[PDB]
Structures are given as C-alpha cells and as structure tokens.
Structure 1
Amino acid sequence: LWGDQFLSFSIDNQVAEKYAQEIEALKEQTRSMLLATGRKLADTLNLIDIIERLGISYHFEKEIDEILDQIYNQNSNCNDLCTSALQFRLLRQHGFNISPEIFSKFQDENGKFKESLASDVLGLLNLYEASHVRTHADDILEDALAFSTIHLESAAPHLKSPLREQVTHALEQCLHKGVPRVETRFFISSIYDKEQSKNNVLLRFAKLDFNLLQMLHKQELAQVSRWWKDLDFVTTLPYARDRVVECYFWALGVYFEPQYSQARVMLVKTISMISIVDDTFDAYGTVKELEAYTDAIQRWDINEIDRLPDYMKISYKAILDLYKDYEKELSSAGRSHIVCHAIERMKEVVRNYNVESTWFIEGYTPPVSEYLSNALATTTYYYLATTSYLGMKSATEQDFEWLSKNPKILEASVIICRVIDDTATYEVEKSRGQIATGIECCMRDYGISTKEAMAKFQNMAETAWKDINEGLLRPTPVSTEFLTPILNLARIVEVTYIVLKPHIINLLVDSIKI
C-alpha cells in the first residue's frame, strides 16, 4: 500500500557530502573517546553501550573489541548490579564467555536474587536485558527474567522520562532480540534525544549517520522497486502482491551497513521471488500443476518449462534468470561458484512446499518430529541465510560448507521462526482446513490442549534462543560476520510476530529530525 512512493529517489549529493564530511569529524572524535586512558569501568561500559544503542558501533569494531577483551581479562568486581549485568551482557554478546558467577553477590545462599535489589531500577533494567543472553549453563540466571520483569512492571508508572519509556519499551522488546535499525531508531529519537545527560557529540553523530545510511537504503529500495516493475508480475501474475517494500525491510533487518549494499539487493530479490512461489503453492496451483512445478525446480533446466502451465512458466523463467544475474554479478570477483548453494536450498524449500501441500490434501497430521523435518525448511530460513552470504565479499566456500551442515545456530534460528509462526497463524490455518499445522500435530502427538501445545512451542523457541546465544561464544566455527545474519533472521521473527508499516515508515520514510 506504498505505491510509487519509492519508485525513484534523487539523492541530493550536497546534503550527503555535508553529512559525510561532518560524520568524519565526529567519528574521529568518538574514536578518541573510546581510547581515553583514565576511565572507570562503569564509564567505559556505558560509553560502549551508548555507541551501540545509537547504531554507530559498526565504525568501531576493532576498538570496542580490544577494550572488551581487556575487561574480560581483568575480571574486576564492580559490586553493583547495574554495572555487573551490563558487563555480563556486553561480553556475552561479543562472544566472551564471562562466567555468570558475577551475579552470586546479588543472590542469597539459596541462589535467589536478593529481593532488596527490587528498588534498583537501573540494575533491574540491565539485569532484564542480560537475562536474554543466557545459555543452558547459566543456571544462576534462571529467575533473572521473572524477577526483573515483575519489579520493572511495578516501578515503571512512576519513573521520570525518558527512563520510563525505555523501561516500558524494554518490557515489550528486549534489546538483544530486536532488529538493530528498529532499536537504534527508537533509542535515538525517543530516549537519548530526551536524555538530560546525553553526550551531544554522540547524539549528533548518531543522527547524521542514521540519516545518511537511510539515503543509501532508499537508493537500494528504489533500484529494486524498478527491478520489480520490469518483471511486470502485477499483470502477468495477478495472484501475488507487491510485497517488495516488506521484503526490503527483511533484508535491511539482516544487515544495514553500507558494505552490505550488494548483499541486501541480492537478498531482497530472493525474498520477493520465493514469495511468489509460496503464493503459487498456497492458493493457485492445483495438485498436478504443483507436482509439475516441484519437478521443474529440481531439474533446474528451462526445457522443463514446456510441462508447466503459462503462469508457472513466468515464475520459473524469472527464477532461473535471477540466478543467472547473481552469477554474473559475482563474476568480477570470481565468486559465482557459490550461487549453487543458494539454488540447492531453494530446491529444498520447494520440495517441502510440495510435501506440505500433499499433507494438506491427504488430511495428514504427522507427529511433531516428522512435522518439523519438513516444516522447518518451509520457513525459508536455511535458504535466506544461505542467500545472505551471496553478496558478502568475504563469504568463502568453507563458510557455505559449514552452513550446509545445518549448524546448531542456524537450526535454532529456523526453529524460532517455525514455532512462533505456528503459534501465531494457528487459528487462521485451522479455519482453512490445514490440519497439518504445527500446533495441531503437537496436540495430537502429545495428547494436550492447544494452550499446552503453544506453551511447549514457546519453550522450544526459548531453548533455541539459548542455543543461538551459545553459538555466538568464542571460538566460533566461522567469523562472527557470518553468524550475525542468522541471529538477525531470528530477531526479525520477534518483530514480525509481537505490522511492518510503522517500522518501514520509521526506517525508510521518515528521517530523524536533526
């Protein structure tokens, strides 16, 4: 419902250059802040936390890492909940397996959190955020979420602004599980901007940087929108909607940095394309047509097009063409040889789409284990994760080989999307006759109520998050650069099922008022 609002974006080079020039000054100035010698732990942690929440930490990957490494190594006891929880969270998010023992001093000989901390809002907030980065080994943090949650909920109504808005927001969306750009936009405009103790250099820096990057995101969105119009699916395939803007939001959620410009464009096209296919199997193709389509996809030829009805011929050709473009784009860098990994994942998605169709027609309700073996791939997550690597100039063959083994971190990301999707779309899918819905299989397989089935599904998502958190800890199998996209895919789930309009507006329409 966007229209020609994004067909084309004429970037006024003057404003961009001004922004860039000043950003360079602010960047160097901020760098010097990070390298300040005589700073206290609390101050150093808050500085890093602020730069990250402001969405400008990508400029200081090395600096922040070296500083955090020093903090990890010195193991200093801060003694106060606020700093301890923050220290724990930042180290964990950066792969440092800091021991949860740092929380023992805030617990009774029973391991329960000293209820006396219940009046320490700042400590509770940082503990709340830290509880979301826990692993299966962090037994000490078992009751951290419930503890901080109940007390923050109680204190919230009487807190000053913007602290109150920060707490209220956190309770609805924790930092660790939120989409980066979405959380950055919120922190900048709704919190830091209204913070009495704000650092003006950092705020100015954050605003300019966000706005400048937004211009690039707009060029990409415009470029891809033109690409979509050329395909002219609107008239040739009147059963699919112009979801391009939504598809772009997803790509933006996976990575927003300027270096991933090519990657985002490639990713958007894939998301758009597979969306067409999903529509085909869901409400247009007949039993026979779908079987013919699944086969054509597995063969991946073109001569197979003759066995497909006209509408499917358009889709099929476009898909094959898209991958040819990908191969061409990567030719200059000699990376075209990796595209096959994405194709293999697409074939997988289509096979499982077909199987899902078959299950629906037969009225089959498989046990959970069997349901998942097919339903996990239908989320398209393995496929999208593989696709995100295509445009990443550093993604080597080894990285793709690791990804093909279905790494636990990827598996967890996929599971999160699956169980959450099933919990949300259950009602709609049931009234549609889809008795092969995750929640349905769960109920029958275990012999439990819908409520209990959904509760089990939520537990699976929780378990998966802990797995993701563990998968981020050093030593990582591949560079962190390749783990973030998977983590971001899981974050997108949290945002899509708490719909995209407000985020699209805040991220791609409205700039932050400087």
Structure 2
Amino acid sequence: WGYDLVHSLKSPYIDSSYRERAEVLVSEIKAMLNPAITGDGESMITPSAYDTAWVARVPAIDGSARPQFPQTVDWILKNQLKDGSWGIQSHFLLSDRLLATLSCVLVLLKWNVGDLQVEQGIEFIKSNLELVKDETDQDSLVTDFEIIFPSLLREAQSLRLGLPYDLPYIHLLQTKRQERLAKLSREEIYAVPSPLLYSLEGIQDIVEWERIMEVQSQDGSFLSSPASTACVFMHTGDAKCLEFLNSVMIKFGNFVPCLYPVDLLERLLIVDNIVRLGIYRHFEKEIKEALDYVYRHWNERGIGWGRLNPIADLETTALGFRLLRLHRYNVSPAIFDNFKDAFICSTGQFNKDVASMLNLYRASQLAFPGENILDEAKSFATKYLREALEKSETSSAWNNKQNLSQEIKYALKTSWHASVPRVEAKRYCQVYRPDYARIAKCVYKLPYVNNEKFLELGKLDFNIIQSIHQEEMKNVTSWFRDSGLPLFTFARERPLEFYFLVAAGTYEPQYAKCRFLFTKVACLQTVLDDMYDTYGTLDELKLFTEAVRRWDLSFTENLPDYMKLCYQIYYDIVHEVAWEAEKEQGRELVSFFRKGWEDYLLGYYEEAEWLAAEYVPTLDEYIKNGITSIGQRILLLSGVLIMDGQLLSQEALEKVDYPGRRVLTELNSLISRLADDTKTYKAEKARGELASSIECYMKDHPECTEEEALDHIYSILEPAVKELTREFLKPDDVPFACKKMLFEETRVTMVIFKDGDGFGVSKLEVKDHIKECLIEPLPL
C-alpha cells in the first residue's frame, strides 16, 4: 500500500498514442450517431420477419392478384434460417421463432409461393412445439404471444396445415388468451388508446374496424406496429394506414421492424448508455442535441417510445424524466400520474414491465424536496422488483442468458447517491453488451445503442484516466513522504484514501491540481482532527488555537515541539492552496481561506472544550458545531477554487458555499456528519467516546429510545440529501464542473458511510474500492 504499491505501477495507457486512439473512436462514434441525432437515419432497428409477413399480406391496391409490396415477399423467401425458422440468427427465442415462422409460412401460402420454405417452416414449428414439455419450457414471450399465437394457429388450422393443434401447450395458450381478453374494456378500445392497439392482428374477431380509426396514431399507424396497421388496412382500406406502411418501406427497403419509429426511446437509450459507460464527456454536443429533441416532445401526458404514440410508455417516460433532470432540464415528477389509478403497469410483456420499473426506480432517486410522488414511486418499484425476482419468468433461459436477476439485484442494492462514479462506469463496461437483443413483437436490436465501438471506447477511456491517476498517486505519495506529516505517529497515514475521495468522482485529466491540493489538505486535516479530538491536551490546544488566530510563524516558539511542526505544515499548505486559487481565480483569496480555516479550527476547539468538560451538547449545538468543524467545507473549497478553467466570482461561490445556508458545502457537511454518526456511533459509544448526534438527541429527549433517536437522525439526513440533489442539478450560472465536483465528493463520502448500523466503517471495503477504482485496469 501507500508509496511502495503505487510506485510499482507502470501503466502503458499513459502514452499519448492511447488517447489519440480514443480520439479516433470518439470521431467514429460521432459519425455513427449523426444520422440518429441530426439526420434522418433515426430509428435504426433490425428486421421483423413477423411484421414483414403481415405487410406482405396486403393485396395490390390496383386489384391485381399480387402483393402491394412484393419486395417483402422476396425478402421473406431469401431470409429463412437454416433450421426453417425466420428470426435473428444470433439469438434463439422459441416464441419469437414460432410467431415469425408461422406468420411467414401463412403469407407465402397466401401468394402460392415458396413451397420449400413453407415445408421447412412447418417442420420447424411442429418439431419445436413438440419439444415443449411444460410451462417452464416455453421461455420468454414476445409481446402478446399468448393472444396472437392461438389466433394465427387457428388460421393455419383452417387451411389444414400439418401442425400439432391438440398439444396441451396449445390448449394452455388459448386458456391464457381468454385470461388476457377477460380484463379487456372492449367499448373503450375505440375511445381510449391502449397497448392492445399494438396487436390488433391477433384480435380480429373482436375489433369493429369501422370504429377503430378513432385511436389511430397521427402517422396512420396503430401504436407504431406495421403488422397491426397492415391488418387494419386490409379490413378498411384506410389511406393513412397505407401511408404509414409506405413510409416504413421507403425507410427500410424490403422489410419492416416491429416498432416504428422509436425516435424517443432510441435517443434516450443512446444517452443512457454513453453516460453509464462513463464516456459522456466526449459527446456533450450529441447528448444535448438528443435530449433537446426529447425535451421538445416532452409533455404533461408523458412520452411513448415513438413521438407519435397516442399513449405514454412508462419505460420511455421514466427514462426520459431521469436523463432530462440529470442534464438540468426542468421536468416534473407529476408526469408519473399518467401511470396511476384510483400505480399499475402490471400489464404487458415481462421484459418491458421490468424495464419500466427499473427505470421508475432509478428515476425516483432523483427526488427534489417535497416531491412525494417519487417517494411513492420508489416504494412501489422496489416492491415490484423484489416480487419480480421471485417470478419464474425471471429465470427463463432468455433472461438467464442476459443475467436479468443479477441486474435487478444490483439495481436494488445500488443507491445513486451512495455510488462511486468511476467504479460504476468500470462495472458497466463489464456488463454492457454490444450485441444486446431486446424483445417486443419480435426480438430486435438497436445498433446505435448496442455496438462494439461504445464498449471499445469505454474500456480504453477508463484505462487511460486510471493510468493518469496512477501517475498522480506517485506524486501524492512522494509529496506525502517528504511533507513531514508522517512524523505525526498518533495519526494514520491515508494519502491514497483521500486521493480516492476526490479522484473517484472528479476524474478529468485537466483537474490534476484540484485533486492534488484536495489530497494535501485532507492529509493535513486528519492530523488536525486526531490532534484536537484525541492527542492534544486542552491547554496545548488552547495554545495551538491562539496561533491559528495570529497567522504568525514566529509566534510558534510558544508551542510544544510537535505543534511547532504541525503549525508550519498547516501554514504552508494553507498558503499554497491560496496562491493556486488566486492564480486560477484572478482575485484575492488568502483572507477568505484564512477565515475559513479559523472558523473550522475554532470549531474543533469548541468541541475540545466540550470533551474536556465532559459536556454533552444539545442536538442543535452538536449539529451547529459539526457543520463547521467536521472539515468538509474548507476541504471542498480547497479543491473547487482551483479547477482548471472554472471561474468562481464571490457571487457565484456564495451560491454553493455560505455558512449558515443550505447550499452545497453546508449540506455536504451536514450529511457527512450525520451519515458518519449513523455508521459509527455504536463503536464510539462502546469505546466511551464523546456523544454523537444520537446521544445528544437522547439527552434532549430522556424518555425516547436509542431506536427513535436513530430514526430522527435519518429524518434529518433524508431531506438534506434531496436538497443536495436539487442544489446540484438546479439551473444557474455557477460553472457546472464546480457543482459536480462538490456533489461527487459528497457521493463518494456517502458510499463510505452507507448502511449505517452504527458498528463503524469497513476499512476492507474502502481498500477494495480503491483497488477497483485506481489500481486494477480493465482487460481490453
């Protein structure tokens, strides 16, 4: 550990060639995304054999005995898989292959072509249907499979195709179809747009086609589904339906996908993945263009995956809310009322429902003060997700191959606030799949979202940043060794821990100086802390505190030897920080820093007097002192004022730093003090340490229990965390990098104190985070 471990690191990723390579990847990615963000190549989605076969059914509008879109028939004839099914070869999903193959077989028969393909398709369907022994064999179901497949299979039955209609699994599916159809409000089909519009081709006996146009989308589609629209067209001759089908053929050539457009969901998925891979800083322009488009279509009624959907989609809407808010757009959690009653979202195909609830769960964590609906959403999504873990569908072959249960479990144990940013990006680089397949009417892929380039850049960029930090850690530990701080043997040496506290969140190459000075100050502070609350005597501390007031090196002749040294190092670090800040800021700051240091250490001295008198403060007193004395404020200031290119006027600084006000530095200090207390008060109580916030409350409330006391501390912490979030994301003219630096340091602090049982901080978990974040690179 420390000096020896760090100087043994020799990362190759430091060489300029790696960053130059990463820049080529950045340019390639910009070029790849351009059609989706700026051009007309939006909605890049794979073919749906199933939908293509429905479009192929449409007879020529000139009345001739041939398809209106003969290129789709040609496509189908040419794209059968080796096993006789139609679908995407990379991924096998039984329900997808069954539905698509039966769909294709039937249209080839309609046009009396493809005898061989039909023969091979029928064999696939028969042979695979006979492999199903029980329900656990069926695997994940494509959208509305239970409704559509029995309908499509009855069409085959009327043609007397050689299929096993009498299998128990087939009877079960009809049973499931009835179950679904029974909850249907049929009269309302025509008045209130619903998810079933996506699959009208499966409920043809139910729909009065003469009334269904009322819920048609503006582009002529039925909930963006080519199959569903083709069906309505063949029943009605509706011009707008035909226009939709034409527009999709024009866009894709000789096939159609199972959803179109997916303009909103695709843009959001692109941004989500770029952000989670930790590569967002390279694509500010593209993220802004993408989110601006989404925001244009954002409305009080929510959004669908496609901007023309006549009903909102929770998945897209929850994702949109989170990414928009995170990027400082103004959105209200009131949009979630669109998914309530008397919360529902228990209808639809399983993967979509789970995705919607994962997204709702993550969105709920971005709550601002007073947003009760998000607390409700959090509770609801949590319960949903825990139940989903117990459902057999979650353990289907399809879901297991994608590690769904692992993903759900990870989401539930992960608090957005209590996250290490660099670590989350590293971890996502290890989970992201370039060939990820999604499910709707058929299995599909979105290559703008899931591709090799994203991952290539993710892993490389992570490794480069890490190697840069490793060189910085050599500088840190080298400075530390010669700094004099190791001479204070009453204090633990933790230079890497403090470097991690800042570098795990504020990682960009240009902020080397910020990280360096922040680490120096934190190293000094741990000594000052041990000195005031443990090692020093009150009379010694009174002397040190007077020296603090005087700012005079000559005055230290009066101090004990160890304090003479401590004062010298303190004085040097304070003024090095101040010089750097004045350089970056172009205005005087020595006086402001000095006042900050005095208030902080006078805070320690007040606490030292309490300890000496065995005084237990009121909770109000303890928190007041703690906000000032815990040390986060002066430490944060020591970093935030020396960020390359980040100008903070007094006016701007006061927006994020203002003792006595609920601004970023104040909230961080409050949260740090109380989170620490919740994590540590029990070990400290046992050791006989001076009272914490818990103990102070109990003195204030003699009859209250320890349990009530701890609950009260959390009742202070939780509101404070929401305010922190709002202060961070709030639109203003404070350089965002500065606000982010403050917020991210708070987030890493919260990681250290997460899950406060009172026992103490896990020193081993800290080491593991440092190892993961700063020591071990990603294999390429």
TM-score range, shorter chain: over 0.9
Among candidates 415, 435, 443, match of residue 174 of structure 1: 415
C-alpha deviation, 1:117, in angstroms: 8.0
Among candidates 578, 600, 607, match of residue 356 of structure 1: 607
Q: Distance in 1 between matches of 2:423 and 2:627?
A: 26
After superposition, residues 494-505 of structure 1 pair within 5 angstroms as: 494-498=750-754, 499-505=765-771
Give the direction of change, closer, same or farther, for the CA distance of 1:337–1:166 in structure 2 (3 Å limit). farther
- What is the TM-score with the length of structure 1 in the denominator? 0.92
Say if 2:502 and 2:745, in contact at 8 Å, map to a contact too: no
Q: Distance in 2 between matches of 1:176 and 1:113?
A: 27
After superposition, residues 396-411 of structure 1 pair within 5 angstroms as: 396-398=648-650, 399-406=652-659, 407-410=661-664, 411=666
Q: Distance in 1 between matches of 2:728 and 2:744?
A: 12
After superposition, residues 214-225 of structure 1 pair within 5 angstroms as: 214-225=466-477
Q: Distance in 2 between matches of 1:254 and 1:300?
A: 33
Whichever residue aligns with residue 5 of structure 2, its letter is Q
Residue of structure 2 equivalent to 1:492 = 748
C-alpha offsets along residues 235-268 of structure 1, whole Å, 9 cap, x if unaligned? Answer: x322122201101101213401111111111111
Residue of structure 1 equivalent to 2:295 = 72
Question: What SS does the corresponding residue of 2:470 show, helix, strand or coil?
Answer: helix
RMSD: 2.4
Residue of structure 2 equivalent to 1:456 = 712
C-alpha deviation, 1:331, in angstroms: 6.5
Seq. identity, %: 32
Give the direction of change, closer, same or farther, for the CA distance of 1:340–1:47 in structure 2 (3 Å limit). farther
C-alpha offsets along residues 156-183 of structure 1, whole Å, 9 cap, x if unaligned? Answer: 3645343333322221223354121121
Say if 2:514 and 2:639, in contact at 8 Å, map to a contact too: yes
Say if 1:129 and 1:176, in contact at 8 Å, map to a contact too: no
Considering fraction of residues, name the structure with more helix. Answer: 1
Say if 2:357 and 2:385, in contact at 8 Å, map to a contact too: yes
Question: What SS does the corresponding residue of 1:175 show, helix, strand or coil?
Answer: coil
Among candidates 225, 229, 245, match of residue 481 of structure 2: 229
- Is 1:51 matched up with 2:274? yes
Moved more, 298-307 or 47-56: 298-307
After superposition, residues 387-402 of structure 1 pair within 5 angstroms as: 387-393=638-644, 394-398=646-650, 399-402=652-655
Unaligned runs of 5+ in 1: none
Q: Distance in 1 between matches of 2:349 and 2:753?
A: 30
C-alpha deviation, 1:11, in angstroms: 5.5
Give the direction of change, closer, same or farther, for the CA distance of 1:113–1:309 in structure 2 (3 Å limit). farther
Whichever residue aligns with residue 181 of structure 1, its letter is R
Say if 2:419 and 2:748, in contact at 8 Å, map to a contact too: yes
C-alpha deviation, 1:457, in angstroms: 1.4
C-alpha deviation, 1:106, in angstroms: 1.3
Q: Distance in 1 between matches of 2:5 and 2:382?
A: 41
C-alpha offsets along residues 433-471 of structure 1, whole Å, 9 cap, x if unaligned? Answer: 334311111222244211111112112221112112222
Residue of structure 2 equivalent to 1:322 = 573
Say if 2:627 and 2:673, in contact at 8 Å, map to a contact too: yes
Among candidates 368, 372, 376, match of residue 623 of structure 2: 372
What number of residue pairs does the alignment pair up? 509
C-alpha offsets along residues 362-418 of structure 1, whole Å, 9 cap, x if unaligned? Answer: 222222212111011222221122112232132323233444424524232222212
Q: Distance in 2 between matches of 1:473 and 1:214?
A: 27
Q: Distance in 1 between matches of 2:567 and 2:317?
A: 55
Unaligned runs of 5+ in 2: 44-262, 305-311, 438-449, 755-764
Whichever residue aligns with residue 25 of structure 1, its letter is V
Residue of structure 2 equivalent to 1:88 = 321
Q: Distance in 1 between matches of 2:574 and 2:667?
A: 28
Give the direction of change, closer, same or farther, for the CA distance of 1:124–1:364 in structure 2 (3 Å limit). same
Residue of structure 2 equivalent to 1:202 = 454
Say if 1:131 and 1:145, in contact at 8 Å, map to a contact too: yes
Residue of structure 1 equivalent to 2:548 = 297
- Is 1:23 matched up with 2:22? yes
Moved more, 335-344 or 298-307: 335-344
Residue of structure 2 equivalent to 1:255 = 506
Say if 1:338 and 1:390, in contact at 8 Å, map to a contact too: no
Whichever residue aligns with residue 472 of structure 1, its letter is F
Moved more, 69-78 or 296-305: 69-78
Q: Distance in 1 between matches of 2:599 and 2:542?
A: 14
Say if 2:584 and 2:643, in contact at 8 Å, map to a contact too: no
Say if 1:419 and 1:438, in contact at 8 Å, map to a contact too: yes
Q: Which has the higher contact order (CA 8 A, sep 6+)?
A: 1
Residue of structure 2 equivalent to 1:156 = 389
Whichever residue aligns with residue 184 of structure 1, its letter is A
- Is 1:436 matched up with 2:652? no
Question: What SS does the corresponding residue of 2:704 show, helix, strand or coil?
Answer: coil
Whichever residue aligns with residue 75 of structure 1, its letter is W
Say if 2:752 and 2:766, in contact at 8 Å, map to a contact too: yes
Question: What SS does the corresponding residue of 1:483 show, helix, strand or coil?
Answer: helix
Q: Distance in 2 between matches of 1:310 and 1:94?
A: 52
Q: Distance in 1 between matches of 2:273 and 2:621?
A: 45
Moved more, 317-326 or 86-95: 317-326
Q: Distance in 2 between matches of 1:169 and 1:505?
A: 20
